[PDB]
Assembly symmetry: C2
Homo-oligomer: 219 residues x 2
């Protein structure tokens, strides 16, 4: 897969107010091990909140999504507004509450949520051209808001969350932490990761499969 360029969209730095750090790093690892290149992006805007990860309480400060996401990529990131679908072969979106607070407002709006316009436009551009999409953990919640047609996807086994996604037009398929769901016609791959994982090795098993599948779909 040398030569393949995989877009990666981040939402901050940490599970509670940005991207799930394990999920993001596991994604980068799997991409690199396959010989492909990650091309990272994050929207240039303030985070919805800033959470003390030690206590779970909100902090009285403000942080920029792009600035904080740069921590994960060691500075090698660009504003999402600069993404060029023609230069990408696929798109992957890791989870964390940032996917539900910053890339969308699923966390507070549920089925009436809106998704970041630049996220919608990039994802639609991939689908137009037949380039695969990989969404992890809670990130698949954005899919039935982006695409106005039925899609096979998963967020694991949680019945309440699955009910919400169905209300939005998805077909929810149960999946364990170490496997994936694939909508073959639309080339969309999903996996639960931290929705179900009890440790990092269980999250890596599902993520590795997701990345592998995305790369196969991109050929």
């Amino acid at each position: 897969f040398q030569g393949k360029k995989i877009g990666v969209v981040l939402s901050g730095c940490g599970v509670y107010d940005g991207t799930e750090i394990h999920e993001a790093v596991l994604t980068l690892l799997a991409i690199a091990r396959s010989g492909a290149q990650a091309v990272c992006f994050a929207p240039d805007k303030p985070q919805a909140d800033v959470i003390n990860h030690l206590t779970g309480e909100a902090m009285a400060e403000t942080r920029n999504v792009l600035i904080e996401a740069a921590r994960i990529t060691r500075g090698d990131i660009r504003p999402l507004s600069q993404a060029q679908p023609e230069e990408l072969d696929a798109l992957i979106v890791p989870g964390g509450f940032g996917a539900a607070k910053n890339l969308s407002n699923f966390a507070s709006q549920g089925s009436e949520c809106r998704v970041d316009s630049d996220v919608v436009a990039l994802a639609k551009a991939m689908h137009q051209s037949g380039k695969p999409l990989g969404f992890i953990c809670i990130a698949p919640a954005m899919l039935p808001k982006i695409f106005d047609f039925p899609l096979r996807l998963t967020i694991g086994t949680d019945i309440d969350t699955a009910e919400v996604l169905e209300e939005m037009g998805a077909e929810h398929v149960p999946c364990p932490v170490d496997d994936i769901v694939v909508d073959e016609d639309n080339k969309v791959v999903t996996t639960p990761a931290y929705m179900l994982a009890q440790d990092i090795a269980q999250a890596a098993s599902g993520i590795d499969k997701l990345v592998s599948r995305v790369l196969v779909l991109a050929e």
Copy 2:
């Protein structure tokens, strides 16, 4: 290795002002995949600085080392002052500039640096009992300040940095990104990681070997 408890000491969240995020997550991954348990700690104190990872410039704010390190561990971390050497089988310290700013002041003091007292006491406790130590990237710079005896270690191949460590009493051994150096008598393992890595898969190759070796030394 089920049952093994591996202490992990963090310094923040991000290469420039805390722990190198890739290195920390790769460490956790390798520990979990081997069936052992990571036990994470970070000192409860302010970071030396806060760096914009997008530009590399300092920011006009203050952040707590423990609070930010909790991002990497999804909240599963304790203040370093609470570490109980009797409950640990080994100790691993990932790199990032935080190891040189927060766990020590190597970044500004070089060979005249001081190391966090709780870092020194925990590391000494491991060595007393014959429990292995694994230090990654720039973290090995702390070793000849902690132990007043010669130690075989590596930070890669950088001649200037190696010269400083030698001034402090170390025996520096060249090592590539995908290998390790082991001081057998003192059970100390080091690897360069981001001192030399050009991507995350190259850092993982060295880290995986380090963790494996630490686990073997802990049996």
